[PDB]
């Protein structure tokens with residue numbers, strides 16, 4: 001996306017994996033954080049920010 | 055990808071979502087099933103299975 | 109599944125049809141199907157981490 | 163009382179970057195990026211205040227070989243130095259042993 005663009009990607013993906021929000025095990029933040037992530041993925045805000053930053 | 059192969063795909067994915075094994079909120083197996091699905095994903099058995107039927 | 113529907117929450121009667129209904133009302137113990145993760149289904153059943161993306 | 167939750171993250175473009183006025187700014191304003199906007203959204207939905215913090219060693223890392231001492235972004239949570247992590251942290255079997263993950267928000 002950025003100058004000087006002297007370098008390029010090749011080939012397809014070897015695999016697929018995901019990022020996620022992480023919390024210490026069993027903490028009371030985990031489930032409302034997960035619900036917030038779900039709602040934000042349903043609203044598409046993550047895609048708007050993706051366009052914003054790429 | 056299989057006969058009759060007579061349609062044509064148009065466009066890309068409009069979004070992204072996933073499937074999951076799901077159970078009533080009444081049983082302890084939600085952790086070992088998660089560990090099983092992760093193990094199968096890391097051992098590449100999904101790739102063998104996907105490259106068996108598509 | 110008795111009537112061949114993936115199913116959702118009904119027309120504001122808040123009864124569940126199809127496979128989700130079969131889980132919530134205790135007709136079966138575990139679903140193994142292309143059941144898409146959604147914010148309304150997370151209300152009543154637990155999902156593993158996804159096994160595929162689409 | 164509302165705690166200012168101890169958020170931990172790592173600098174990486176465009177996820178988290180020092181804004182070019184960092185010599186003249188204080189607090190969270192020095193940090194902007196995709197993960198900072200996501201943290202703001204998450205906090206605004208949950209309804210709490212938060213304070214950013216940065217990883218010590220600069221590594222994602224894992225448990226050290228033959229010792230299983232955790233470090234990096236995982237170690238900070240395993241030793242309870244912070245409340246929540248918001249970073250390009252890949253979901254893996256070894257990390258699921260000790261910390262929980264949300265549903266995946268991006269694929270790669």
Ligand SMILES: N[C@@H](CCC(=O)O)C(=O)O
Nearest residue numbers: 073114115142143144145
């Ligand atoms: N896997 C889908 C099937 C129906 C569809 O969305 O096309 C679901 O669980 O809802």
Ligand SMILES: N[C@@H](CCC(=O)O)C(=O)O
Nearest residue numbers: 019222223250251252253
């Ligand atoms: N997302 C990766 C970053 C480091 C890498 O695997 O390249 C992780 O969490 O470990």
